[PDB]
Structure 1
Amino acid sequence: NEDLPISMENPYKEPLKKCILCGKHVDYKNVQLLSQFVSPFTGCIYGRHITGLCGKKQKEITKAIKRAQIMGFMPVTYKDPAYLKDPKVCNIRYRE
């Protein structure tokens, strides 16, 4: 009876995965981060499968990108060549 298993909440529980921006503040004036999530050649916003972002962060990234592009902070058709040197985070492989 002393050796019977007992009920507890699961140990060995890894903490839940967190997105790269999780806990961070996305602002429409942060066009280095928004440029990171914008495609280098055609200016397309990337999806969840490319960015690896959680759903709320993907929504804030989309809204901030559209806001900055219409307010005149970001180019629409291309990524800024000044920000085409930042740490790449998006899981996309154009060259070969």
Structure 2
Amino acid sequence: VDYKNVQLLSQFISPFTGCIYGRHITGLCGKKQKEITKAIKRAQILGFMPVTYKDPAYLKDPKVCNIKYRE
């Protein structure tokens, strides 16, 4: 994992709000869940990725999360 790649960190983030998904949506080992959380928050503070929204240039990435927003 890394804090320099915005796309990988931003796949695990809600597009409308910017929240970070938990284990029940993401589905990782706890080690990688903690590394994704720390890598996102480091990118949030250091100025590489947006806070309030998903960066819209990476909006059409493949969906790894299991949350369904449209019903």
TM-score category of the 2 structures, normalised to the smaller one: over 0.9
1:1-96 equivalence runs, <5 A: 26-96=1-71
How far apart are 1:28 and its partner, in Å? Answer: 0.4
How far apart are 1:30 and its partner, in Å? Answer: 1.1
Residue 6 of structure 2 aligns to a residue whose secondary structure is coil
* TM-score normalised according to structure 2 size: 0.97
Q: Which has the larger radius of gyration?
A: 1
Partners in 2 of 1:54 and 1:39 — Cα distance? 20
Partners in 1 of 2:50 and 2:21 — Cα distance? 15
Q: Which has more helix, going by share of residues?
A: 2
How far apart are 1:72 and its partner, in Å? Answer: 0.4
Partners in 1 of 2:28 and 2:6 — Cα distance? 17
Partners in 2 of 1:53 and 1:83 — Cα distance? 22
Can you give the 5+ residue segments of structure 2 that lack an aligned partner in the other structure? Answer: none
Q: Number of aligned pairs?
A: 71
Partners in 2 of 1:65 and 1:56 — Cα distance? 14
Can you give the 5+ residue segments of structure 1 that lack an aligned partner in the other structure? Answer: 1-25
How far apart are 1:81 and its partner, in Å? Answer: 0.6
Q: Which digits, 9 at most, give the CA deviation of each residue in 1:45-81, with x for residues without a partner?
A: 0000000111000000000000001000011111011
> What corresponds to 1:20 in structure 2?
none
Runs of 4+ displaced beyond 6 Å? none
